[PDB]
Amino acid sequence: MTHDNKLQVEAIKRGTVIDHIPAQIGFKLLSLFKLTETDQRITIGLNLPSGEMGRKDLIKIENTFLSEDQVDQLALYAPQAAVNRIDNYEVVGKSRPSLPERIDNVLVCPNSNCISHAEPVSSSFAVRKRANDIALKCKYCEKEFSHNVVLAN
Amino acid sequence: MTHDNKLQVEAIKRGTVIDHIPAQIGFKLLSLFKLTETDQRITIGLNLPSGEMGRKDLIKIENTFLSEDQVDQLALYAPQAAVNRIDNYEVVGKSRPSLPERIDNVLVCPNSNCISHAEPVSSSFAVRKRANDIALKCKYCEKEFSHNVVLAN
Amino acid sequence: ANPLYQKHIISINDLSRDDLNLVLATAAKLKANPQPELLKHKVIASCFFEASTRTRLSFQTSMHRLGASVVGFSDSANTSLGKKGETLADTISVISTYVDAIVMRHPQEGAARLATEFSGNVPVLNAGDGSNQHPTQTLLDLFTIQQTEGRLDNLHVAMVGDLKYGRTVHSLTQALAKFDGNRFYFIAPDALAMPEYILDMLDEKGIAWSLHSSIEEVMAEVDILYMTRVQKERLDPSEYANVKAQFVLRASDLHNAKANMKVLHPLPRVDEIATDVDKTPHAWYFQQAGNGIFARQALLALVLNRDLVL
Amino acid sequence: ANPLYQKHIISINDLSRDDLNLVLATAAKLKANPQPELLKHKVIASCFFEASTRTRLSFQTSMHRLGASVVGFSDSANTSLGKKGETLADTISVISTYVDAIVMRHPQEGAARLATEFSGNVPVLNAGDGSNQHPTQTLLDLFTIQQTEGRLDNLHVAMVGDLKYGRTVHSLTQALAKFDGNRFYFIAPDALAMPEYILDMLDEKGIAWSLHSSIEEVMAEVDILYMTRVQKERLDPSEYANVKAQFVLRASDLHNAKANMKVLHPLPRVDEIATDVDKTPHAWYFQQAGNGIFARQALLALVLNRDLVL
Amino acid sequence: ANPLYQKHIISINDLSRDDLNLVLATAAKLKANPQPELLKHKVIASCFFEASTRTRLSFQTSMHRLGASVVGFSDSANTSLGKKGETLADTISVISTYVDAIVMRHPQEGAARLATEFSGNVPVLNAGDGSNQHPTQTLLDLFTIQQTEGRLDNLHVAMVGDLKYGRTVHSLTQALAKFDGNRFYFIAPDALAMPEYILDMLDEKGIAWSLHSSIEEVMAEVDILYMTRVQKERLDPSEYANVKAQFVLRASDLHNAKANMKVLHPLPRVDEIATDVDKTPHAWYFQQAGNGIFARQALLALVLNRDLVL
Amino acid sequence: ANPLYQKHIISINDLSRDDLNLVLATAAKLKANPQPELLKHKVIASCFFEASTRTRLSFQTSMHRLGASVVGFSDSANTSLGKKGETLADTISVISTYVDAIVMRHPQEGAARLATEFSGNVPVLNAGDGSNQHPTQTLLDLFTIQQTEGRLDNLHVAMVGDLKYGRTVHSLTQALAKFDGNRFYFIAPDALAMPEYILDMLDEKGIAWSLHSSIEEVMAEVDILYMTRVQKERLDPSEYANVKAQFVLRASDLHNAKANMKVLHPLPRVDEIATDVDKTPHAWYFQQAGNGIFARQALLALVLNRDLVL
Ligand SMILES: [Zn+2]
Ligand SMILES: [Zn+2]
């Protein structure tokens, strides 16, 4: 959108703006999804006065749009996050994270005897909701864990 | 040391501006020295252009200062980053990265047999600028390595 | 082509009620009229990365009665291959350039699955992977249950033993819960009760189930008595021996049994089923072991052969 | 009869340029039109006195695709036979009265040769003997090099790794130096440089060779990149890890590579070749492993069959 | 003569409250004023039929601190005795003719009870007998609680981890059960819950106790947090990983804790106590291992001197 | 307080020339006038995580000679500690609460440096830490040179055998490198040449050195012949046998040798020093092993007594 305390601040030309990320979850997302790995002008605002929502994180990836699928990968980490598509210095699109069905190579199988650990494979867990508690199922060992357990690693 | 006067980027009042970070390193720095694990308002800019080097990274940390020591640890990654200390809306003093005599917590010993690998010990290397390159001697196994090697990839 | 042509057999959940019936239909038909050269010219890999004679011997006999050749190994003692450091992925990748199909047993869950990802066209068949899946054992329990009861729906199936770790009782319940009106009885030690994830699974289906403390309770009700070996290690020698008594089977306990109730057990048994039972019409473990050949043969035939002439 | 009929395959020096080409000619032709019963009724011994799954599995598959039967063993754990005290001589002498041919792997150099002296008519094929010969691995590298480059003369062949102990790079150089105009590049650690006896051998032939400290140097020049596993044990963990960096291969290092350059590696690889290379057109180890079957099949076919119908 | 003179320390059950006190009372004096020549000229057999280095080095440092000589051995398999023929009774009958006291750890329950029957007049101290007892570990625990809390009565003890198999918690709950007003908090995963026989005894004696789901609920009342190690082998890897995070202590958790609160663990710790906990003043696991030296000297001193004038 | 009081003897690098002298100076007095009750009432942990019988029996005889008690163990695999879970840090943190000093040998470099961080106030003496250091062996060497030559300055030292891996020569070259005017003769097969980092340091300090092809060239100037064992396993059997005869000493070779010349070897010797050499008065390898007893007593004495009045 438009940041201004009193002092002149940037807003990418065309690109995406992942705004409303909760404090401390921002950088993880940058790490996890390896978002920083391009030649694009990324501007990050950490620990910003979200006031109503206290403190938030914020990313702006200029000249880079995210497929709705990529937007869904944020759910477990930042569900209240709003993903804005910007064109011509204006919000042309406003998406919101949604529970995916599968979350690839970002989580680690808590099952220590899971073949997934040594070998060259990407993690892959099938998501499944229950009274709003997310159980996650490893593609390999086929075991089901609670997201609390998996996310801890 | 980047100045744009149309699509402007705001400047903080007090804190530290880690300017002239070669591209792709601003994130290592972030992870490596755990610069995000703070409540202070940080602001990061990646791949911002500044012809004097092409593309650069730039990190602003509000109400936080780095010691002579803390600044030196960047010597190995962004030898030329310019750490501009700030107070009252203006640079109250600049500082450059000096190669330290010792480097803790962030490197890994290349020695497979070095005990530092399975233990609750923080690594520590002695630095020694010998013709052409930097030598790093492990605290525990005492084996000396070319820095080029200590940076596995 | 048949529905399983070239498909990988890894988990029992991957097969539907109609796939089980196809496999069963074939097994029954290969038992009847043998096709000793159906797989002639094929070469199959017997990769027992985790040793297992019962299962290796069974599979291999299945290969030899269909005309197929066999190469392979057992016990990954050192196998400077896989063990020293070759990543399984790389091992399959190489083996898939020699053989036409791969049967494998591994100590880690998901092994057979991962293999699938590095074998290109070569179908891999899971002969056991950690405490996860052992699909062939089940295809064989079902064949036995169908052969003896004449159906896979409407059975009063009792499962005894280590129902909490028994890799086999978990798989048998899932498959049996693909059919209709099966009621389950869960006689097991308290420290070893059926996992909840299986119980919940059943309730959703609306399947009848109940736990029993002793076998005599459900004796005169059960059609199938499925016993499983209670691993002593899982328990304390005092605890074990305390428990034991309420879970071993003698012939006398069977006087109450129906006329068609068969006692099944994946094997090995030792303490859990007394040899006196060996001599009663109800004994069916050994016969059950022999049905493994037909169950496994039907599996290779379908996977390897485009269309099946039965 | 063909030139190899009943002859023993022991060393690569024992075969001439014309023998290699014959073997290659056949391999190429058996790959094309399979003769699954050519060796029907023959019985072959798989004596892996030194265990080796990659090689045993390969040989045996080669036997099974030609109709031959196989008896044999692996790992001389105790073998109250050979090990306890039976002298190899006596072991062959007995085995040569059962089978028609013997494939064997032994930990000591000259084993396969000695065997030759106690087998009467039974042809023995060396599948590895100490740090001396492993001829079959080479017949297979050459087939791969010919299949991919279309020729065995005038290649820019680079050999990387443990060039001082690498039993394979020594054999590949010798054979390749039977053909014309091959230039060699020797990128290897200083502590592990190509033996001198091989270097001298080349100079006499007047063959072009040069050592390189890094692969990037000869990248855009090489047709074949032959990498070998650098045994950590050969070195000190600090020394090793010091060295390492200048000798592992990543995909990015390959951007400079020609269009037809194939990376080969006897296997296992692990640290030396990153899995990213796995996905580039240049990757040829795995394909290379599959050519082992054709190379070995052609070898048995020729040895065992009087005249070869191709 | 003191009460403990020439007596066998076999089970905690066998020791009275007075007894307990006599031992910890002596322990403190030896810790205050050491006697390095009290047990001079004495020889003690350190018999570890089942290797336990940590317990051995302790008992032995204890024995040297009083000027005693030590001879002994570790692991019968590495030993020469009792591997195929000789009994323990013969082994004890013989050793009781050399030494002045016998210390012994043995893989099977009742092993020390049986020794006291062939030792003659030599007193036998139990350093562990299967899933049965471990007198010394408990006296060392009790001495650490008394020393830090100033009392063994009216305490708030939370016990955590594997309460089913942990022989150590069972035994401390019995000893504390001998003192007045104590209250216990048992926090353990259901598969590893405290046995009924302990609860039954706790209820029969009027002692308060209560299961809890997480330390957090109890952190603020508790005086002593006795932690134990849930061995992942006592479970299924998947199962273990789910309950793991519920019984692992971070220094943060310690926040709303009484000043006087101490954290104990028989050790070895692995995951259960996070390393940041070591810096907080509640960590006392290492000072506990340290007090083992004194509880052990007191006993050796009491058992071998008709009178002590400490 | 003497300089070495309460200090950790980890690396030779850490010791000064003064330090060196203080130790060898004490060593000679203890060898002149023994103190069998100096370290009485002390307990020292002889912790051989990596079994080294010869070094252990030595350190231990040293410990008994001063009246100290010893407890300890050999080979962690035969031990109970650090096999699957517990760390060294926990193992040290615990042992530092029993003993008065820790001696330890460990399979990995830096293992003792790390102990000094959890030992608290207990001083740690390094008896070997991987390819890293071995303080004591060097002080024992230096004491033998000083004792026989009368000085550590202006010496003619030839070092022979495996100069690349021999941790012992590296360390002695550093210690001697601290004294004035020494000159070294490095005779070693090229595959086992002295590392560059030593030469670099030798050159930086102004110290003369020079490679030589055979002892013969140097036999007449040299005062001390430090021999080492080229392990045939650090090479290829064939390779080893070719260079063997160039670094093996026969009593004949000793012919044109200075009266004062002594032959040293850390032992075990196997082929390198021929048995006829034992009768010539240059053999001093056994009297060296003997002096290890004194260099070790001095250190234990220095480290545990604020003042010595020898
Ligand atoms: Zn998994
Ligand atoms: Zn190190």
- Three-class SS state of A3: coil
d(CA D296, CA E36): 77
Q: E28: buried, middle or exposed (CB in 10 Å: 19+, 13-18, 0-12)?
A: middle
CA–CA distance, E153 with D166 (Å, rounded to integer): 73
Q: Identify which of F165, F191, F236 has the shortest CB distance to residue D131.
A: F236
Helices then strands, counting H and E runs in chain F, come out as 10, 9
User: E207 vs chain F: nearest CA distance in angstroms?
Assistant: 34
Which residue blocks in chain C are alpha helix, DSSP H? Answer: 17-32, 53-64, 88-95, 111-116, 135-149, 167-176, 196-205, 237-244, 285-304
CA nearest neighbour of B76 among B151, B152, B153, B1: B151
Largest interatomic CA distance in chain C: 56
Tokens of B153: 């990839």
Q: How many residues does chain A have?
A: 153
Show contacts of E32-37: CB within 8 Å, 24+ apart: E33/E310, E34/E65, E35/E66, E35/E301, E35/E310, E36/E65, E36/E66, E36/E67, E36/F41, E37/E66, E37/E67
Check whether residue A30 and residue A76 sit in a common domain: yes
**B95 and B107 fall within a common domain:** no
- D108 vs D132: CA distance, rounded Å: 8
Question: From the centroid of its chain, how far is CA C46?
Answer: 17
Radius of gyration of chain B from Cα atoms? Answer: 17
Considering only CA atoms, which of C302, C293, C309 is closest in space to residue C136?
A: C293
Beta-bridge partners for B127: B136
Structure-token match 């009760």, residue found: C193
User: How many Cβ atoms from other residues are within 10 Å of residue B39's Cβ?
Assistant: 12
* C196 touches E: beta carbon within 8 Å: no
3-class secondary structure, F70: strand
A108 and A95 within one domain: no
Count CB-CB contacts under 10 A for residue C21: 16
With an 8 Å Cβ cutoff, is D165 touching chain F? yes
Q: Are the CB atoms for D133 and D112 separated by under 8 Å? A: yes
What is the distance in angstroms between the CA of the first residue and the CA of the last residue of chain F?
14
CA dihedral sign of residues E3, E8, E10, E13 = negative
Contact call for residues F128 and F55 (beta carbons, < 8 A): yes
Q: Are residues B78 and B109 in the same domain?
A: no
Domain identity same for B15 and B61: yes
* Contact flag for F and C (3+ C-beta pairs < 8 Å): no
Q: Which amino acid is at E49?
A: F
Q: Do chains D and F touch (3 or more CB pairs under 8 A)?
A: yes
Q: What Å distances lie between residue C183 and C16, C144, C150, C152, CA to CA?
A: 20, 18, 16, 11
Three-state SS sequence of chain E = CCCCCCCCECCCCCCCHHHHHHHHHHHHHHHHCCCCCCCCCCEEEEEECCCCHHHHHHHHHHHHHCCCEEEEEECCCCCCCCCCCCCHHHHHHHHCCCCCCEEEEECCCCHHHHHCCCCCCCCEEEEEECCCECHHHHHHHHHHHHHHHCCCCCCEEEEECCCCCCHHHHHHHHHHCCCCCCEEEEECCHHHCCCHHHHHHHHHCCCEEEECCCHHHHCCCCCEEEECCCCHHHCCHHHHHHHHHHCCECCCHHHHCCCCCEEECCCCCCCCECHHHHHCCCECHHHHHHHHHHHHHHHHHHHHCCCCCC
Instruction: For residue F113, give both structure tokens.
Output: 């440096």
**Domain D134-291, CATH class in plain words:** alpha beta
Contacts of D203 (CB under 8 A, 6+ apart): none
Write out the two tokens for F118: 């959890």
Burial of D117 (0-12, 13-18, 19+ CB in 10 A): exposed
Beta strands B42-50; A42-51: pairing state: antiparallel
**Bridge partners of C70?**
C44
Contact between E143 and E297 under an 8 Å Cβ cutoff? The reply is no
Please list every residue in chain D whose beta carbon sits closer than 8 Å to the beta carbon of residue B137.
none
Q: Is residue A2 part of a domain?
A: no
Q: Across the strands, what pairs with A42?
A: A61, B46
Between the CA atoms of D12, D17, D21 and D27, what dihedral angle is there, to the nearest 10 degrees?
0
With a CB cutoff of 8 Å and minimum separation 6, the contacts of B146 are: B133, B134, B135, D242
Nearest to F194 by CA among F205, F179, F184: F184
Range E131-162 burial, b when 16+ CB lie within 10 A, else e: ebbbbbbbbbbbbbbbbbbeebeebbbbbbbb
User: Which chain F residues are within 8 Å of D131, Cβ to Cβ?
Assistant: 236, 238
Look at residue B65 and tell me if it is in a domain. Answer: yes
Residues B77 and B31 in one domain: yes
- Report the C-alpha gap between C231 and D285 in whole angstroms: 44
**Cis before residue E268, ω within 30 degrees of 0?**
yes
CA E304 to chain centre: 21
Resolution (A): 2.6
Kindly report, as residue ranges, where domains of CATH 3.40.50.1370 are found in chain C.
1-133+292-310, 134-291
Return the residue matching tokens 């309420």: C246
Pairing of strands A124-130, A102-104: antiparallel
Which chains lie within 8 Å of chain B at 3 or more CB pairs, if any? A, D, F
- For residue A61, give every residue at least 6 positions away whose Cβ sits within 8 Å of its Cβ, in sequence order, or none: A12, A15, A16, A17, A18, A35, A38, A40, A42
CB count within 10 Å of CB A100 equals 18
Q: What are the backbone dihedrals phi and psi of residue B95, each rounded to the nearest 5 degrees, phi first? A: -160, 140
Query: How far is residue C143's CA from residue C140's CA, in Å, rounded to a whole number?
Result: 5
- Is B3 within a domain? no
Residue F94 CA neighbour count, 13 Å, CB half: 25
Q: What are the distances in angstroms from CA D122 to CA D2, D70, E221?
A: 17, 15, 85
| Residues in Cβ contact with F248 at an 8 Å cutoff, skipping those fewer than 6 apart | F271, F272, F273, F274
How distant, in Å, are the alpha carbons of C177, E186, E206, E208, F259 from that of E201? Answer: 44, 15, 9, 11, 84
Spatial strand order of the sheet with B90-95 comes to A90-95, A82-87, A15-22, A54-62, A42-51, B42-50, B54-62, B15-22, B82-87, B90-95
Closest CA to D183 of D160, D149, D206: D206
CB E140, CB E27: distance < 8 Å: no
Instruction: Give yes or no: residues A12 and A74 share one domain.
Output: yes
Q: Does the bond joining C123 to the residue before it have cis omega, within 30 degrees of 0?
A: no
List, in order, residues 6 or more apart from A4 with CB less than 8 Å away: none
- Extended beta strands in D178-281, E state: 183-187, 209-212, 224-227, 262-264
Dist CA D75 CA D55 (whole Å): 13
Those residues with Cβ within 8 angstroms of residue E22's Cβ, 6 or more apart along the chain or in another chain: E2, E3, E4, E302
From the list E131, E165, E236, the residue facing C131 with the nearest CB is E236
Q: Does F74 touch chain E (CB under 8 A)?
A: no
Cross-strand pairs, C154: none
**C-alpha C227, offset from chain centre:** 13
Q: Tokens at residue D180, please?
A: 């014309």
CATH of C1-133+292-310, picked from 3.40.50.620, 3.20.20.70, 3.40.50.1370, 3.30.420.40, is: 3.40.50.1370
What are the φ/ψ torsions at residue B90 (nearest 5 degrees)? -145, 150
- Work out whether strand A82-87 and strand A90-95 pair parallel, antiparallel, or are unpaired: antiparallel
Task: Name the burial class of residue C82, with classes exposed (0-12), middle (13-18) and buried (19+) by CB atoms within 10 angstroms of its CB.
Answer: buried
* 3-class DSSP assignment, residue A100: coil
* Separation between Cα atoms, residue A72 and residue A96, nearest integer Å: 8
Give yes or no for a cis peptide into D266 (omega within 30° of 0).
no
Q: Do B81 and B119 fall into the same domain?
A: no
Give the residue from F34, F45, F97 showing the smallest Cα distance to F68: F45
Contact status of A141 with chain E (Cβ, < 8 Å): yes
Backbone angles phi, psi at D184, to 5 degrees: -120, 140
CB of A142 less than 8 A from some CB of C: yes
One domain, residues B135 and B93: no
Could you tell me the two tokens for F125? Answer: 């003496």
- CA dist., res. E285 & res. D78, Å (int): 48
CA–CA dist D198, C267 (Å, integer)? 59
Q: What is the DSSP string of B53-118?
A: TEEEEEEEEET----HHHHHTTTTT-TT-EEEEEETTEEEEEE--PPPSEEESS---S-TT-GGGT
Instruction: Look up the domain containing B91 and give its range.
Output: 8-100
Residue ending a domain, among B100, B121, B138, is B100
Q: Is A11 helix (H, G, I), strand (E, B) or coil?
A: coil
For chain A, the distance separating the N- and C-terminal CA atoms, rounded to the nearest angstrom, is 34
**Edge-first strand listing for the sheet containing C124-129:** C69-74, C43-48, C101-106, C124-129
The strand pair at B133-138 and B144-146 is best described as: antiparallel
Angle at alpha carbon of residue C108, lines to C104 and C112, rounded to 5°: 35
Name the minimum distance, in Å, from the CA of D269 to any CA of chain F: 22
Q: Is F264 helix (H, G, I), strand (E, B) or coil?
A: strand
- Token pair of E278 as six digits: 């070591």
Residue E269 near residue F90, CB atoms below 8 Å: yes
F265 marked among binding-site residues: no
Q: Which chain E residues touch C191 with a CB distance below 8 Å? A: 191
